[PDB]
Structures are given as structure tokens and as C-alpha cells.
Amino acid sequence: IYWIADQFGIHLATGTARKLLDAVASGASLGTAFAAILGVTLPAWALAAAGALGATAA
């Protein structure tokens, strides 16, 4: 995700997701604020993948 946002970056969230990206990067443990940002374009299962065994820098 940290690689697709650069090359592609088709889903630029410079609205509210910004305030989150400035926190999740240090401790992405949100369960409601993360699903509200990864629900506009990203899937729903991705929320469960964030835990472990999933893309962390992709």
C-alpha cells in the first residue's frame, strides 16, 4: 500500500485520511477510522489483514 500510493496514487486521500496517516504510520490499530478510509476504494477484508500476514508497505 505504501508503494501503490506512490507510483499509482489513484486514491489520494488528502482530506481526513491525512490526520490518520500521521498516526497509523506509528500505530495503525484503528478499527473504525481505518475502515472508514479503506471503504471508499479499498475492500473490507483488508481491515482484517492489517492485523498480520498482510501488505504492510505494498
UniProtKB/TrEMBL annotation:
It comes from the Bacteria. The chain crosses the membrane at residues 25-53. The keyword Transmembrane helix applies. Keywords: Membrane, Plasmid, Transmembrane, Transmembrane helix. This is AciA. The keyword Membrane applies. It comes from Lactobacillus acidophilus.
